[PDB]
Amino acid sequence: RILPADIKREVLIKDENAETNPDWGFPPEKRPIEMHIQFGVINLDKPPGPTSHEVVAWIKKILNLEKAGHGGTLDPKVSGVLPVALEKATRVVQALLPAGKEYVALMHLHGDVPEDKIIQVMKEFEGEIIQRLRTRKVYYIEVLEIEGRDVLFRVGVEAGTYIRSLIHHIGLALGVGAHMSELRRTRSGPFKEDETLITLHDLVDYYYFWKEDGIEEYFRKAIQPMEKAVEHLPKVWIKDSAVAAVTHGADLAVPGIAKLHAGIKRGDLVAIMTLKDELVALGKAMMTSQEMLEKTKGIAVDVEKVFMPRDWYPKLW
C-alpha cells in the first residue's frame, strides 16, 4: 500500500526571515472561479466504455474549454482515476505520467487452483518483472478475496506496467492460465479515491449548477488547483523577489531559496513553489539539497516549464 510518492520529505529552512506579501499572487483559495479553471485539474472517475481521449473531448465540449489533457491513458473498459489537466495547467500532466499507479483488478483463472497456492504464487510477483522487452516494478500485491476461479486483488506498480500482462503471467505461473476480467485504477500519483474523485455526471451537473443556476460552490470543488498535480514532487520554495524572474525564464539561483525538501539529488524533477504554495514552474535540480542549503551563489534549479503568469508578482529585479 506504499508507493515511492508516499515518502515523507523533510523541509530544510534556508532563509529564516523570508516572508511573503499577501497582495501578490493568487494562492488556490484566492482564485476566482474562472482563474481556478484556467489553472485547474480534474480528478476524474472514468466510466467503462469510452476511450480516455474521448472522455476528454467530451469535457472540453461540455465545459467550453479550449484545451485539456489527461494523464496515464486508461483503456476503454477500465474505470477510475484519470487526472484531466485543463487549459493553462495542461502541461502539468508531464509530472504525473512517470508517477506510480494503483489498481484493483479481477482475475479469472482458467482452471482450479487452491487459494493458498494462488496467494503464494502471486506474492512472488512483487519486485521487478519483465513484460512485453522492458523491466517494471511491482511495489505490492494484495489478494482481497478469492471465489473459485475469481481472484480479486490490489496492486501498486510503476508507470507503464500493464496489469493485463501481469495477470497473464500469473496464469502461466499457476499453469492453468488466466485473463483479466475487470480493472479499476484507484490511484495515480497524488490523485486517489477521495472526495475529489468525481464522475462525469457530477462534473457536468455541477458545471450547470454554476453556469445556469449561479451556484459556484459545487463546480469549484469539482476542480483541483494545479498545485495538487505536484504534491508528490520534491519542492523548493522561493522568495517573492525571485518569482517574477523565474516566470520570465530565469533559472533559479541559490540566493532565491527560502526553504526546500531534503533528499534532492542532481537531475531530479522539482517543483518551484512560492511561499504561498503556488506552483511557479517545473525544473531540474542542478544541485543537491545540501548544496543548495550551504552555498550562497550558483544556479540551484534549471527552470524548464513555467506555469505561473508573468504578472502575478511584480518585477522586483
Binding site: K61, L106, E145, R184, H201, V204, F209
Partner: protein, 53 residues
C-alpha cells in the same frame, strides 16, 4: 460488473455486505455517461432536490 466497494469501509469486495464495515456495498464503477445526456435535465432536477439547491 462484479467489483464492489463499501461506501463506509472503502473496502473492495465481491460481496454485497462489507466483510469489514458490515455495510451494504455498491458497484465500484461509475454509471456510463453519454455526450448526448438525454435525461440530463431530469437527473439535475433530482440532484438539486437531493442537495437542497
Amino acid at each position: 460488473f462484479r467489483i464492489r466497494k463499501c461506501p463506509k469501509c472503502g473496502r473492495y469486495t465481491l460481496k454485497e455486505v462489507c466483510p469489514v464495515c458490515g455495510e451494504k456495498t455498491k458497484v465500484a464503477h461509475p454509471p456510463r455517461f453519454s455526450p448526448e445526456d438525454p435525461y440530463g435535465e431530469y437527473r439535475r432536477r433530482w440532484k438539486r432536490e437531493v442537495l437542497g439547491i
